[PDB]
Amino acid sequence: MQILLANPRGFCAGVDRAISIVENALAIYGAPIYVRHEVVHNRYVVDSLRERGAIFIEQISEVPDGAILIFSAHGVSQAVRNEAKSRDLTVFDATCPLVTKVHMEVARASRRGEESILIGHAGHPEVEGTMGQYSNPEGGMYLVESPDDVWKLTVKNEEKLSFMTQTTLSVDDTSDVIDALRKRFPKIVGPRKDDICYATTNRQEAVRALAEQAEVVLVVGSKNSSNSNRLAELAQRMGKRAFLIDDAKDIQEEWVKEVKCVGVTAGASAPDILVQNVVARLQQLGGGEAIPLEGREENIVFEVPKELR
Amino acid sequence: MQILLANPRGFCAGVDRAISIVENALAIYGAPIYVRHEVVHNRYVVDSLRERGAIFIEQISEVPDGAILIFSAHGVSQAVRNEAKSRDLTVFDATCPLVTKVHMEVARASRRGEESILIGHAGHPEVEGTMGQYSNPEGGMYLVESPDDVWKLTVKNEEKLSFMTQTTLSVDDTSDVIDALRKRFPKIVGPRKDDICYATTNRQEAVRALAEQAEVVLVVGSKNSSNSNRLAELAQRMGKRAFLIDDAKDIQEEWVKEVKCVGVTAGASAPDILVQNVVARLQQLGGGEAIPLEGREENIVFEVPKELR
Ligand code: DMA
Ligand code: DMA
Ligand code: F3S
Numbered sequence: 001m002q003i004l005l006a007n008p009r010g011f012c013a014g015v016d017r018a019i020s021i022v023e024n025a026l027a028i029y030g031a032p033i034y035v036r037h038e039v040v041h042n043r044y045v046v047d048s049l050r051e052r053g054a055i056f057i058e059q060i061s062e063v064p065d066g067a068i069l070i071f072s073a074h075g076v077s078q079a080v081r082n083e084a085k086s087r088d089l090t091v092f093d094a095t096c097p098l099v100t101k102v103h104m105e106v107a108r109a110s111r112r113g114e115e116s117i118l119i120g121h122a123g124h125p126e127v128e129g130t131m132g133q134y135s136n137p138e139g140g141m142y143l144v145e146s147p148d149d150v151w152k153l154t155v156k157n158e159e160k161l162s163f164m165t166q167t168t169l170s171v172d173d174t175s176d177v178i179d180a181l182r183k184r185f186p187k188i189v190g191p192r193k194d195d196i197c198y199a200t201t202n203r204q205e206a207v208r209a210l211a212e213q214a215e216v217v218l219v220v221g222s223k224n225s226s227n228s229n230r231l232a233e234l235a236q237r238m239g240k241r242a243f244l245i246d247d248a249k250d251i252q253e254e255w256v257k258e259v260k261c262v263g264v265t266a267g268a269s270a271p272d273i274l275v276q277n278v279v280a281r282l283q284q285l286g287g288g289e290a291i292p293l294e295g296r297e298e299n300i301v302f303e304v305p306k307e308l309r
Numbered sequence: 310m311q312i313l314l315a316n317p318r319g320f321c322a323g324v325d326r327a328i329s330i331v332e333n334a335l336a337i338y339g340a341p342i343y344v345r346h347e348v349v350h351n352r353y354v355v356d357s358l359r360e361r362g363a364i365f366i367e368q369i370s371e372v373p374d375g376a377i378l379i380f381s382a383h384g385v386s387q388a389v390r391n392e393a394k395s396r397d398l399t400v401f402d403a404t405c406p407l408v409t410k411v412h413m414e415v416a417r418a419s420r421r422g423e424e425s426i427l428i429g430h431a432g433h434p435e436v437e438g439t440m441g442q443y444s445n446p447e448g449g450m451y452l453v454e455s456p457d458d459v460w461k462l463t464v465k466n467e468e469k470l471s472f473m474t475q476t477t478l479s480v481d482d483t484s485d486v487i488d489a490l491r492k493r494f495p496k497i498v499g500p501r502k503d504d505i506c507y508a509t510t511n512r513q514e515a516v517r518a519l520a521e522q523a524e525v526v527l528v529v530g531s532k533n534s535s536n537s538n539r540l541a542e543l544a545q546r547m548g549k550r551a552f553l554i555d556d557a558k559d560i561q562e563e564w565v566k567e568v569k570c571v572g573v574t575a576g577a578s579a580p581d582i583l584v585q586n587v588v589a590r591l592q593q594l595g596g597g598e599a600i601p602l603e604g605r606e607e608n609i610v611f612e613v614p615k616e617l618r
């Protein structure tokens with residue numbers, strides 16, 4: 001059985017920065033360090049940090065006074081940010097710069113009292129944080145997940161309307177939502193294409209290439225990782241059995257039973273060590289040396305705040 | 310005399326990467342290493358690299374077969390890229406990712422055969438490279454520098470039009486041109502605001518804050534550096550005497566005599582050592598300890614290609 005590895009795969013710049021922020025905070029201030037929401041959606045990373053003294057909570061009311069709190073890479077609403085500010089807490093923001101970018105556009109629309117539409121998945125922390133940047137009652141902030149949602153949305157004034165998107169969506173599905181938005185609201189303004197980040201776009205391009213060669217695709221990533229789910233979904237849509245797994249232990253023999261070529265990739269929040277263990281398991285199951293496919297080279301790095309070096 | 314330092318100032322992520330590409334190529338392959346055009350618009354940087362074995366040329370035809378060629382941070386046209394590709398040369402592209410980003414949009418428009426308008430300064434290498442991404446004869450690629458140029462522009466189809474901008478322009482001036490574009494071509498499409506990079510936006514924001522306290526502003530940068538000139542221009546437009554200088558040696562006593570507060574900043578292509586030397590010179594001219602102003606933190610880094618690390 002041939003083992004192919006998608007390229008690029010794994011850690012993006014926002015995730016590496018976010019994890020480093022927590023690790024450095026722990027090294028500088030020692031345990032415990034509070035983090036609002038899993039720093040990144042990866043069980044291994046979260047479990048490891050917890051073992052190191054990090055405490056993950058969902059609400060600021062779960063954080064003691066005088067404590068150190070870090071916002072996850074997914075970002076937080078202004079309400080959450082203000083609640084933390086009103087509290088006696090030292091705050092470090094690990095929100096990815098590319099999520100913050102969208103936040104600023106929403107804040108701008110809110111200040112102008114102009115309505116905005118966000119394309120994203122309800123319930124996701126990034127959506128909650130981004131929609132949470134809009135506060136002007138005279139305007140409006142709406143969420144749409146599909147063309148159907150666009151088809152039934154009504155706004156106060158479509159002459160002054162803008163849109164933004166979640167950073168980890170399916171490039172193809174989002175394109176369809178945007179087409180619908182422009183057909184429905186011809187005067188709507190937004191980015192050239194979307195707010196989907198480079199890492200998401202690159203990994204989806206990479207898994208598409210992997211899928212046209214592999215019969216089965218394994219995506220290393222946790223169940224609550226949006227970008228990871230989109231990778232598995234993309235492969236499945238291409239007619240390939242694709243599985244989202246946290247570690248090599250989740251691999252079932254039947255999945256690669258008599259398979260001549262299996263492909264492996266990883267979400268933006270999955271550590272390389274997990275991929276290495278998955279490859280080792282596949283090799284125990286008959287796979288040969290892992291072959292990395294040629295791909296788009298990534299060179300972006302986001303540094304931790306000087307205050308945490 | 311009080312010395313204030315703008316923040317941020319100096320090296321951006323694109324320049325740091327570009328210089329590192331030339332330095333590492335030299336370290337790995339040794340001299341000579343050929344570079345098309347100045348890697349960055351800074352006399353000191355170019356002179357230093359030349360002293361290290363880099364040979365700056367104007368046309369790829371000046372480069373011998375089997376040699377190593379590097380494209381400057383400003384980018385190159387498709388014609389130049391294809392010329393190098395057909396040659397027996399090892400090519401490393403130091404084009405800044407943020408310039409490449411704009412290149413991609415122009416190529417996209419050319420593919421669709423839709424006309425594009427670039428806001429930029431004629432003669433600049435970045436403009437040459439970006440307009441050089443448009444090839445479709447059925448479309449069109451136009452350059453505009455002012456609102457006036459927009460008023461006089463004639464296009465084939467105003468229904469299918471898009472715009473892009475140079476990365477180092479004046480944020481305020483470009484805003485004026487864009488306002489004119491949308492007023493003239495209501496259906497024109499483009500980015501939310503412009504293609505001015507974070508570094509340019511941040512340095513202009515920083516010099517604005519500096520000029521509010523300083524009576525005189527020294528901008529470290531070469532005469533052919535677009536972003537550097539915009540910093541000096543911004544300070545001068547605020548009513549402060551501004552000087553664009555290559556190094557401490559250019560400082561004239563008369564410029565700062567009796568001056569109570571002098572501010573110092575540097576363009577994206579100027580090394581920090583030059584700023585340190587300028588501060589030293591100002592100190593022997595009566596200046597005190599240099600005081601860094603508080604500013605927007607930058608955390609972006611662009612790694613050199615894996616082959617050159
Ligand atoms: C945009 C972002 C913060 C990505 C990090 O990956 P993740 O799996 O932790 O988050 P997501 O669920 O958005 O893919
Ligand atoms: C966009 C870019 C490559 C900036 C680097 O600075 P530079 O002085 O070398 O070039 P520019 O003339 O565009 O400011
Ligand atoms: S938005 Fe940021 S954290 Fe990762 S997947 Fe995208 S870079």
Ligand code: F3S
Nearest residue numbers: 321323324405407506
């Ligand atoms: S476009 Fe790139 S090289 Fe510097 S000034 Fe801007 S980052």
